[PDB]
């Protein structure tokens, strides 16, 4: 990275200070005598952005000059977090900027903390897109992310009287120094209208128009010359009763990009959401085609622009089914506008698109009513019906007698209200389909889409998820990054598999102590934060037991809560008995319409109030509901964690990525054999994780036999006490019936079988406590996790997409 | 200097626009230049703020719902002395600065004269070194863009901020809360206005450079935003977020009415919004000042603050200041009221009844319950004094009340402004006299010294140096450039009377302007323009009182004369009429359609040819005014006597070498006083003649029957000559002219046409024409807004130019 001492190094810092002062003066228009911390943040942000402009421009020129095949990552979500520190690190500028800011008499941490998260995602899906952008830039791929510039991202969460409340995430209030508005590149998007079938062919007419205006954010590679782009579209009314009302009604078009739908793993079939999906797809495809036509591969024949080489120059990855409309939109452009024959257009379409499936939970599946699609996108409905007809004609030819197979494989679900199965659309319109962990990809291929995989074996793949070690180690845990570098060099950042070199320090007491010291420093720093936000006295010798992720029945924060109450009851039963102290932290947002998740939050805060204030418990056990969990807060809590809770019901968590973050940062994992937890066990050795509970076949057996929650309740005395306390008002004395809905769910409607894993979970937790009392054995197991975490770099993931799906090479 | 401007341009294109030159747009170049120029005033902007903090001059706050600012690039270059160096830098970069200048959107945050006065005043106050800020609303959409479709006005949203605004700086850190609705409790710790809805006011600051000095003042415009904090009093999450639009709608769009009151609740919200944010900001600045430390600190407030109310639109400033002083700062009513009167002054801009702001009490009670209480108390103490002085005069109470009781009760906002201000002024001598001695006679009798005149003015930066550099240069070469800061120096040009070499130079400047504008006209309208024709121009908002219709009758009169005798001598004219109609103003829209209909016939009649062409000049606005005004030979200023409070277009034309045809109305009267009445083409009824015809009764039919030329014109309009596919299209106009014409179009037709004949005669004698032009230009000095501001400063604000 850029030097700070010596002749040149002194000048580097000098220039940065000069640029900072120039921005404060000319850009912010403030004298130092009236400037605030926020002004200083913005002055530094502009200074840092200026430092990547040369590479950003040169990267665009390079892609134009050499025509590498381009990768377009199309997603409704990019969960980017804060940009300042990540950019400084990737540009090799952090040391120099740190020094400049220090010499100016300012506190760099304070400036960095001013920045709002770009919270343009819900959880793992959106964050995967963000990690992927970093990795694709670091590997030199010609890759752009395309999404929506929501005016409001994921809501800011507060807790009031123990319940979640939502506030608007007004992240653009003070502006965004990391985007460049580019209205000259605006493109039209059409809605409603009708289809006309005339002598000149099929026309989509009488439509309403909304403009898509792009905003570009730079995506710097780690220590290279690549600066890629994230292009996010914002909706505007076209410029073309009551004049005043007509002007105000421009708000209706602009509402398309107003707010991120705050649902994680849950389908809500709202018209505004469908508009968002078509909006991002239509603007993105027009932009991609425009760039292709301007490129050196752009050429024209009698029949118009030649698209033969389009899939040799363009790969589009569909992040879940949310941008599934890209398939019929590309066909619409090829057939209605460019006049290609259907067969040729369909062939080009399949070669262009690949689809990533991110969940098998039924409630998450996009099934759009046909009548809604007919109203909003009539031509796309026609095109989808035609795709389905030609799809089913092939199936009839292959399997003349199998009538049910046609029903199973149709893109249309015909019962009651007819709906479009967007996953089926994505499968037939793409050349590759992948899941996000071995266990999940297998379920996708061999169970959920069995009929499709049988006819096209080689279509279905696995690409196990990953995380970027820039944000999720170098940035969030500089202490650990430094320790690792001291022992094995700094080449691990670009090749994370080099972490296996840490195995040379097995049995090295000095290293095991240094590792523990890093964790302790992180815990002390985070404990400062906790004690300023919450009325709690944190026991500094306690095990930090952490479950942070979106609040879900399938992720089973509720199971964790049952264990918290169990520990509480053991303490009250035997005050003098040995207890390994814990700070139990549970955090995450509930989708605002998700009743059971909101009840689970209230249960946790209610339990916390009892546990934290019981003088017989004291420093043995404290419980924190960590508010407003999001990317920047994840960067704080993850490095401070000793035990990572990854306890989804086997078969429900497609991959997980929080699990990987915790593993890389020195926490041990308690979890089920679900998602990538299975592969973490493969890499580190199963005995080096705290694995428990039903596996996917055990869940299947219990489903076959039939799940009777009451049997576990009657059989397990400790469970009985916990449940009776919750049901009878022990945790809600002013409102004894408060948790009725949770009890009813647990006993009669628990699709995720909390009680069935309780016994194994509590036994497993007891083993965790035992190991924690032996620091040498604890930290030895930690070392074995960190040293085996290399597979989970998103650089590895991206190389696999590049080689086996996109057909592009790292550069 | 040139070398560094080029370097700065390139740095902004690279780092600010993030563009390689190989993919740059013309707009990119405009923005790179705009940032380069803005950078040159930042030092003085910051140091001006420091200076006002350090030395504590009394501050002037110009509070207006409108700032009709036009474009900023050229104006800034001129005031900083950078225009010539920028032109050369841009030329060396292979570009044309005039092309870049055309990229900029107008800041069209006004309707017409009232908003443009505020803009001229900001330039003048900065040039004179006054510690002055303009306070208004940052409308997301300004005055609509006007298109003409099938001869009719159509409106398009003025999306002026689409590509950003390089001449503002957002300052969300200085946001302030504004309250609406709610209810009042009169508690033992004071009156509390509670359970209100809150809207945040986010300020955006635009620099206001003085001409060639060290002053850069500020225009601070507020933008509405929804609050974020959760309230325990707090449905669908998505809908709740979308509904933030409702609060943000307050600053969405300028109400596009000129001289017309529309009592919409959203407009009332706009008025309170600008007032509450502005007063809060002024008090914050006051408390932080050296005078903020001190029996109350506010004793010095009116020695440190003047607030000027631009018309009654920010009238709520009076009860708002009382609310803050009494409810928040805990001052006794008597002290608060004393301080309030000494702080505020009010400018009245019209006596037309349809323009008068009268808010229904029930609307104010709902939206601003505490302000209604305060207005009632102001009124009670007001009427108590009147009863004490005139115990037997019951009707005088009715006349002077702030409340009109007749059925639907309403608040007379002008009355509120009068009682709560120490000074009230009209905007030209004729108008200020009517305001004092007729409209508000009851008030002036009790407080004679309260009522003043301040005749309007225009800035000679935008309206001479910028719009007409040839004329500015020519004047400067003869008498130096002291006239820019003291326009009365133009009287020195009188000495060049009889200098035929100079008169030819003057004529050549006009001719160059005409050729350039002819190119614009041929580009935009594809009509062939006769270079030797008199450019006869009426540009201003479309109004019955401004009488574009009367002009149209003269146009048709000329057409008919040509068709009746094609061999006869005819002095050729290009007749240009332009202006926007308020969208709800039916008659204005009919008048536009009549003009475009007449134009279509006149322009395409082969018997007429190059003798006469007619243009409806589309999308009239500040930047287009700068193009047409310098190209004008004859300026039309033909409002009915007593209806135009002042006018300012009239002054612009006079400064730029046009002769004026007009009535003795508004400032036209003072233009005649300065230049000599014989050097204007004055015609028609005077204010006393209009009163006499009102007394007698106006019967339009009598003029129609007595004047053969009028009859022909009217019958043609009436019977479909100008609308053959829609013979009765103009029925509404005809009905109005005969039975409901409050502005007496026919009554001035004869004098108007006879006057127009004299203009044509003079235009055939270039020496005599240009002699009269010189006498107009040389007598235009009074109409500098620098003169106007000096008088406000001395006689109203009590501040000294610096
Ligand atoms: C309208 C405006 C214009 C400019 C150029 C600035 N930037 C700026 O540096 N202004 C100031 C510089 C100062 C330097 C030395 C001493 C005092 C200075 C004051 C300002 C300045 O504009 N003061 C501000 C003002 O007068 O509105 C704010 C910060 O002060 C209050 C909160 C009390 C109202 C600011 C902050 C506002
Ligand atoms: C996303 C983005 C990023 C950057 C850094 C820029 N700015 C910029 O200068 N870009 C380019 C520079 C080039 C220099 C030499 C040769 C080619 C260059 C191309 C670009 C560039 O980004 N080209 C743009 C693009 O690829 O989207 C536009 C202008 O081209 C199309 C309209 C055809 C799509 C632009 C304009 C867009
Ligand atoms: C034959 C002829 C030639 C030309 C060039 C013109 N154009 C024109 O406007 N010419 C003049 C411009 C002047 C400008 C300022 C001062 C004096 C000017 C004089 C003329 C000019 O040519 N004057 C002529 C002359 O002196 O004979 C005629 C037009 O003037 C009278 C009608 C009074 C006889 C005209 C109008 C006629
Ligand atoms: C990584 C991350 C997630 C994904 O976590 P899982 O435990 O895999 O569900 C969700 N939210 C945030 C803020 C994250 O950083
Ligand atoms: C100066 C001006 C006005 C005022 O013109 P009047 O003829 O005095 O009514 C109105 N609109 C614009 C754009 C102006 O420049
Ligand atoms: C639909 C959706 O958000 N799915 C989520 O996707 C992420 C990223 O692949 C997975 O890690 C996670 O297990 C899964 O729940
Ligand atoms: C209410 C309103 O806009 N009034 C206008 O104000 C301007 C500026 O004072 C005058 O010149 C003009 O005659 C008058 O019509
Ligand atoms: C029942 N339900 C919801 O209602 C819901 C949800 N996520 C958001 N919402 C509204 N999930 C995951 C869910 O299971
Ligand atoms: C009747 N009327 C209007 O209706 C109107 C207007 N200005 C705007 N509107 C709507 N004027 C001046 C007017 O006289």
JSON list of N, CA, C and O in Angstrom, two decimals, chain B residues 752-786:
[
{"chain": "B", "resi": 752, "resn": "UNK", "atom": "N", "xyz": [-55.25, 54.45, -29.33]},
{"chain": "B", "resi": 752, "resn": "UNK", "atom": "CA", "xyz": [-54.15, 53.50, -29.50]},
{"chain": "B", "resi": 752, "resn": "UNK", "atom": "C", "xyz": [-53.70, 53.43, -30.96]},
{"chain": "B", "resi": 752, "resn": "UNK", "atom": "O", "xyz": [-52.51, 53.59, -31.25]},
{"chain": "B", "resi": 753, "resn": "UNK", "atom": "N", "xyz": [-54.64, 53.22, -31.87]},
{"chain": "B", "resi": 753, "resn": "UNK", "atom": "CA", "xyz": [-54.32, 53.11, -33.30]},
{"chain": "B", "resi": 753, "resn": "UNK", "atom": "C", "xyz": [-53.74, 54.41, -33.86]},
{"chain": "B", "resi": 753, "resn": "UNK", "atom": "O", "xyz": [-52.78, 54.37, -34.63]},
{"chain": "B", "resi": 754, "resn": "UNK", "atom": "N", "xyz": [-54.30, 55.56, -33.46]},
{"chain": "B", "resi": 754, "resn": "UNK", "atom": "CA", "xyz": [-53.75, 56.85, -33.88]},
{"chain": "B", "resi": 754, "resn": "UNK", "atom": "C", "xyz": [-52.32, 57.05, -33.37]},
{"chain": "B", "resi": 754, "resn": "UNK", "atom": "O", "xyz": [-51.47, 57.60, -34.07]},
{"chain": "B", "resi": 755, "resn": "UNK", "atom": "N", "xyz": [-52.08, 56.60, -32.14]},
{"chain": "B", "resi": 755, "resn": "UNK", "atom": "CA", "xyz": [-50.74, 56.66, -31.56]},
{"chain": "B", "resi": 755, "resn": "UNK", "atom": "C", "xyz": [-49.76, 55.77, -32.34]},
{"chain": "B", "resi": 755, "resn": "UNK", "atom": "O", "xyz": [-48.65, 56.19, -32.67]},
{"chain": "B", "resi": 756, "resn": "UNK", "atom": "N", "xyz": [-50.19, 54.55, -32.65]},
{"chain": "B", "resi": 756, "resn": "UNK", "atom": "CA", "xyz": [-49.41, 53.62, -33.46]},
{"chain": "B", "resi": 756, "resn": "UNK", "atom": "C", "xyz": [-49.03, 54.18, -34.84]},
{"chain": "B", "resi": 756, "resn": "UNK", "atom": "O", "xyz": [-47.93, 53.92, -35.35]},
{"chain": "B", "resi": 757, "resn": "UNK", "atom": "N", "xyz": [-49.94, 54.94, -35.44]},
{"chain": "B", "resi": 757, "resn": "UNK", "atom": "CA", "xyz": [-49.66, 55.61, -36.70]},
{"chain": "B", "resi": 757, "resn": "UNK", "atom": "C", "xyz": [-48.48, 56.57, -36.57]},
{"chain": "B", "resi": 757, "resn": "UNK", "atom": "O", "xyz": [-47.65, 56.64, -37.47]},
{"chain": "B", "resi": 758, "resn": "UNK", "atom": "N", "xyz": [-48.40, 57.27, -35.44]},
{"chain": "B", "resi": 758, "resn": "UNK", "atom": "CA", "xyz": [-47.30, 58.21, -35.20]},
{"chain": "B", "resi": 758, "resn": "UNK", "atom": "C", "xyz": [-45.96, 57.49, -35.03]},
{"chain": "B", "resi": 758, "resn": "UNK", "atom": "O", "xyz": [-44.92, 58.00, -35.46]},
{"chain": "B", "resi": 759, "resn": "UNK", "atom": "N", "xyz": [-45.98, 56.32, -34.39]},
{"chain": "B", "resi": 759, "resn": "UNK", "atom": "CA", "xyz": [-44.77, 55.51, -34.25]},
{"chain": "B", "resi": 759, "resn": "UNK", "atom": "C", "xyz": [-44.21, 55.16, -35.62]},
{"chain": "B", "resi": 759, "resn": "UNK", "atom": "O", "xyz": [-43.01, 55.30, -35.86]},
{"chain": "B", "resi": 760, "resn": "UNK", "atom": "N", "xyz": [-45.09, 54.72, -36.52]},
{"chain": "B", "resi": 760, "resn": "UNK", "atom": "CA", "xyz": [-44.68, 54.35, -37.88]},
{"chain": "B", "resi": 760, "resn": "UNK", "atom": "C", "xyz": [-44.04, 55.52, -38.61]},
{"chain": "B", "resi": 760, "resn": "UNK", "atom": "O", "xyz": [-43.00, 55.36, -39.25]},
{"chain": "B", "resi": 761, "resn": "UNK", "atom": "N", "xyz": [-44.64, 56.70, -38.49]},
{"chain": "B", "resi": 761, "resn": "UNK", "atom": "CA", "xyz": [-44.09, 57.92, -39.08]},
{"chain": "B", "resi": 761, "resn": "UNK", "atom": "C", "xyz": [-42.66, 58.16, -38.62]},
{"chain": "B", "resi": 761, "resn": "UNK", "atom": "O", "xyz": [-41.78, 58.43, -39.44]},
{"chain": "B", "resi": 762, "resn": "UNK", "atom": "N", "xyz": [-42.43, 58.08, -37.30]},
{"chain": "B", "resi": 762, "resn": "UNK", "atom": "CA", "xyz": [-41.11, 58.35, -36.74]},
{"chain": "B", "resi": 762, "resn": "UNK", "atom": "C", "xyz": [-40.08, 57.31, -37.18]},
{"chain": "B", "resi": 762, "resn": "UNK", "atom": "O", "xyz": [-38.93, 57.65, -37.42]},
{"chain": "B", "resi": 763, "resn": "UNK", "atom": "N", "xyz": [-40.50, 56.06, -37.29]},
{"chain": "B", "resi": 763, "resn": "UNK", "atom": "CA", "xyz": [-39.58, 54.98, -37.66]},
{"chain": "B", "resi": 763, "resn": "UNK", "atom": "C", "xyz": [-38.98, 55.17, -39.07]},
{"chain": "B", "resi": 763, "resn": "UNK", "atom": "O", "xyz": [-37.88, 54.69, -39.35]},
{"chain": "B", "resi": 764, "resn": "UNK", "atom": "N", "xyz": [-39.70, 55.90, -39.93]},
{"chain": "B", "resi": 764, "resn": "UNK", "atom": "CA", "xyz": [-39.20, 56.24, -41.27]},
{"chain": "B", "resi": 764, "resn": "UNK", "atom": "C", "xyz": [-38.09, 57.31, -41.27]},
{"chain": "B", "resi": 764, "resn": "UNK", "atom": "O", "xyz": [-37.50, 57.58, -42.32]},
{"chain": "B", "resi": 765, "resn": "UNK", "atom": "N", "xyz": [-37.82, 57.92, -40.11]},
{"chain": "B", "resi": 765, "resn": "UNK", "atom": "CA", "xyz": [-36.80, 58.95, -39.96]},
{"chain": "B", "resi": 765, "resn": "UNK", "atom": "C", "xyz": [-35.76, 58.47, -38.94]},
{"chain": "B", "resi": 765, "resn": "UNK", "atom": "O", "xyz": [-35.85, 58.81, -37.76]},
{"chain": "B", "resi": 766, "resn": "UNK", "atom": "N", "xyz": [-34.77, 57.67, -39.40]},
{"chain": "B", "resi": 766, "resn": "UNK", "atom": "CA", "xyz": [-33.77, 57.10, -38.49]},
{"chain": "B", "resi": 766, "resn": "UNK", "atom": "C", "xyz": [-33.06, 58.10, -37.56]},
{"chain": "B", "resi": 766, "resn": "UNK", "atom": "O", "xyz": [-32.83, 57.79, -36.38]},
{"chain": "B", "resi": 767, "resn": "UNK", "atom": "N", "xyz": [-32.72, 59.28, -38.07]},
{"chain": "B", "resi": 767, "resn": "UNK", "atom": "CA", "xyz": [-32.09, 60.28, -37.21]},
{"chain": "B", "resi": 767, "resn": "UNK", "atom": "C", "xyz": [-33.00, 60.68, -36.05]},
{"chain": "B", "resi": 767, "resn": "UNK", "atom": "O", "xyz": [-32.54, 60.79, -34.91]},
{"chain": "B", "resi": 768, "resn": "UNK", "atom": "N", "xyz": [-34.27, 60.94, -36.36]},
{"chain": "B", "resi": 768, "resn": "UNK", "atom": "CA", "xyz": [-35.24, 61.37, -35.35]},
{"chain": "B", "resi": 768, "resn": "UNK", "atom": "C", "xyz": [-35.55, 60.23, -34.38]},
{"chain": "B", "resi": 768, "resn": "UNK", "atom": "O", "xyz": [-35.66, 60.44, -33.17]},
{"chain": "B", "resi": 769, "resn": "UNK", "atom": "N", "xyz": [-35.70, 59.03, -34.92]},
{"chain": "B", "resi": 769, "resn": "UNK", "atom": "CA", "xyz": [-35.97, 57.85, -34.10]},
{"chain": "B", "resi": 769, "resn": "UNK", "atom": "C", "xyz": [-34.82, 57.65, -33.11]},
{"chain": "B", "resi": 769, "resn": "UNK", "atom": "O", "xyz": [-35.04, 57.60, -31.90]},
{"chain": "B", "resi": 770, "resn": "UNK", "atom": "N", "xyz": [-33.60, 57.58, -33.62]},
{"chain": "B", "resi": 770, "resn": "UNK", "atom": "CA", "xyz": [-32.44, 57.33, -32.76]},
{"chain": "B", "resi": 770, "resn": "UNK", "atom": "C", "xyz": [-32.12, 58.46, -31.80]},
{"chain": "B", "resi": 770, "resn": "UNK", "atom": "O", "xyz": [-31.61, 58.22, -30.70]},
{"chain": "B", "resi": 771, "resn": "UNK", "atom": "N", "xyz": [-32.48, 59.69, -32.19]},
{"chain": "B", "resi": 771, "resn": "UNK", "atom": "CA", "xyz": [-32.41, 60.82, -31.27]},
{"chain": "B", "resi": 771, "resn": "UNK", "atom": "C", "xyz": [-33.33, 60.61, -30.07]},
{"chain": "B", "resi": 771, "resn": "UNK", "atom": "O", "xyz": [-32.91, 60.82, -28.93]},
{"chain": "B", "resi": 772, "resn": "UNK", "atom": "N", "xyz": [-34.57, 60.21, -30.32]},
{"chain": "B", "resi": 772, "resn": "UNK", "atom": "CA", "xyz": [-35.51, 59.93, -29.24]},
{"chain": "B", "resi": 772, "resn": "UNK", "atom": "C", "xyz": [-35.03, 58.74, -28.40]},
{"chain": "B", "resi": 772, "resn": "UNK", "atom": "O", "xyz": [-35.17, 58.75, -27.17]},
{"chain": "B", "resi": 773, "resn": "UNK", "atom": "N", "xyz": [-34.46, 57.72, -29.04]},
{"chain": "B", "resi": 773, "resn": "UNK", "atom": "CA", "xyz": [-33.92, 56.57, -28.31]},
{"chain": "B", "resi": 773, "resn": "UNK", "atom": "C", "xyz": [-32.84, 57.03, -27.33]},
{"chain": "B", "resi": 773, "resn": "UNK", "atom": "O", "xyz": [-32.87, 56.67, -26.15]},
{"chain": "B", "resi": 774, "resn": "UNK", "atom": "N", "xyz": [-31.91, 57.84, -27.81]},
{"chain": "B", "resi": 774, "resn": "UNK", "atom": "CA", "xyz": [-30.83, 58.33, -26.96]},
{"chain": "B", "resi": 774, "resn": "UNK", "atom": "C", "xyz": [-31.38, 59.07, -25.74]},
{"chain": "B", "resi": 774, "resn": "UNK", "atom": "O", "xyz": [-30.87, 58.89, -24.64]},
{"chain": "B", "resi": 775, "resn": "UNK", "atom": "N", "xyz": [-32.42, 59.88, -25.93]},
{"chain": "B", "resi": 775, "resn": "UNK", "atom": "CA", "xyz": [-33.04, 60.60, -24.82]},
{"chain": "B", "resi": 775, "resn": "UNK", "atom": "C", "xyz": [-33.67, 59.65, -23.80]},
{"chain": "B", "resi": 775, "resn": "UNK", "atom": "O", "xyz": [-33.68, 59.93, -22.59]},
{"chain": "B", "resi": 776, "resn": "UNK", "atom": "N", "xyz": [-34.18, 58.51, -24.27]},
{"chain": "B", "resi": 776, "resn": "UNK", "atom": "CA", "xyz": [-34.71, 57.47, -23.36]},
{"chain": "B", "resi": 776, "resn": "UNK", "atom": "C", "xyz": [-33.60, 56.78, -22.56]},
{"chain": "B", "resi": 776, "resn": "UNK", "atom": "O", "xyz": [-33.67, 56.69, -21.34]},
{"chain": "B", "resi": 777, "resn": "UNK", "atom": "N", "xyz": [-32.58, 56.28, -23.26]},
{"chain": "B", "resi": 777, "resn": "UNK", "atom": "CA", "xyz": [-31.45, 55.62, -22.60]},
{"chain": "B", "resi": 777, "resn": "UNK", "atom": "C", "xyz": [-30.77, 56.56, -21.59]},
{"chain": "B", "resi": 777, "resn": "UNK", "atom": "O", "xyz": [-30.51, 56.17, -20.46]},
{"chain": "B", "resi": 778, "resn": "UNK", "atom": "N", "xyz": [-30.53, 57.80, -22.01]},
{"chain": "B", "resi": 778, "resn": "UNK", "atom": "CA", "xyz": [-29.86, 58.79, -21.15]},
{"chain": "B", "resi": 778, "resn": "UNK", "atom": "C", "xyz": [-30.69, 59.18, -19.92]},
{"chain": "B", "resi": 778, "resn": "UNK", "atom": "O", "xyz": [-30.13, 59.72, -18.96]},
{"chain": "B", "resi": 779, "resn": "UNK", "atom": "N", "xyz": [-32.00, 58.94, -19.95]},
{"chain": "B", "resi": 779, "resn": "UNK", "atom": "CA", "xyz": [-32.90, 59.24, -18.83]},
{"chain": "B", "resi": 779, "resn": "UNK", "atom": "C", "xyz": [-33.37, 57.99, -18.06]},
{"chain": "B", "resi": 779, "resn": "UNK", "atom": "O", "xyz": [-34.30, 58.07, -17.26]},
{"chain": "B", "resi": 780, "resn": "UNK", "atom": "N", "xyz": [-32.71, 56.85, -18.29]},
{"chain": "B", "resi": 780, "resn": "UNK", "atom": "CA", "xyz": [-33.14, 55.58, -17.67]},
{"chain": "B", "resi": 780, "resn": "UNK", "atom": "C", "xyz": [-32.51, 55.31, -16.29]},
{"chain": "B", "resi": 780, "resn": "UNK", "atom": "O", "xyz": [-32.91, 54.38, -15.58]},
{"chain": "B", "resi": 781, "resn": "UNK", "atom": "N", "xyz": [-31.54, 56.15, -15.90]},
{"chain": "B", "resi": 781, "resn": "UNK", "atom": "CA", "xyz": [-30.78, 55.95, -14.67]},
{"chain": "B", "resi": 781, "resn": "UNK", "atom": "C", "xyz": [-31.61, 55.75, -13.42]},
{"chain": "B", "resi": 781, "resn": "UNK", "atom": "O", "xyz": [-31.26, 54.94, -12.55]},
{"chain": "B", "resi": 782, "resn": "UNK", "atom": "N", "xyz": [-32.72, 56.48, -13.30]},
{"chain": "B", "resi": 782, "resn": "UNK", "atom": "CA", "xyz": [-33.59, 56.33, -12.12]},
{"chain": "B", "resi": 782, "resn": "UNK", "atom": "C", "xyz": [-34.04, 54.89, -11.90]},
{"chain": "B", "resi": 782, "resn": "UNK", "atom": "O", "xyz": [-34.27, 54.47, -10.76]},
{"chain": "B", "resi": 783, "resn": "UNK", "atom": "N", "xyz": [-34.16, 54.13, -12.98]},
{"chain": "B", "resi": 783, "resn": "UNK", "atom": "CA", "xyz": [-34.78, 52.80, -12.91]},
{"chain": "B", "resi": 783, "resn": "UNK", "atom": "C", "xyz": [-33.83, 51.65, -12.61]},
{"chain": "B", "resi": 783, "resn": "UNK", "atom": "O", "xyz": [-34.20, 50.49, -12.73]},
{"chain": "B", "resi": 784, "resn": "UNK", "atom": "N", "xyz": [-32.62, 51.98, -12.16]},
{"chain": "B", "resi": 784, "resn": "UNK", "atom": "CA", "xyz": [-31.72, 50.99, -11.60]},
{"chain": "B", "resi": 784, "resn": "UNK", "atom": "C", "xyz": [-32.25, 50.56, -10.23]},
{"chain": "B", "resi": 784, "resn": "UNK", "atom": "O", "xyz": [-32.60, 51.40, -9.39]},
{"chain": "B", "resi": 785, "resn": "UNK", "atom": "N", "xyz": [-32.28, 49.25, -10.00]},
{"chain": "B", "resi": 785, "resn": "UNK", "atom": "CA", "xyz": [-32.66, 48.75, -8.68]},
{"chain": "B", "resi": 785, "resn": "UNK", "atom": "C", "xyz": [-31.65, 49.14, -7.59]},
{"chain": "B", "resi": 785, "resn": "UNK", "atom": "O", "xyz": [-31.95, 49.03, -6.41]},
{"chain": "B", "resi": 786, "resn": "UNK", "atom": "N", "xyz": [-30.46, 49.62, -7.98]},
{"chain": "B", "resi": 786, "resn": "UNK", "atom": "CA", "xyz": [-29.50, 50.15, -7.00]},
{"chain": "B", "resi": 786, "resn": "UNK", "atom": "C", "xyz": [-30.08, 51.40, -6.34]},
{"chain": "B", "resi": 786, "resn": "UNK", "atom": "O", "xyz": [-29.96, 51.59, -5.13]}
]
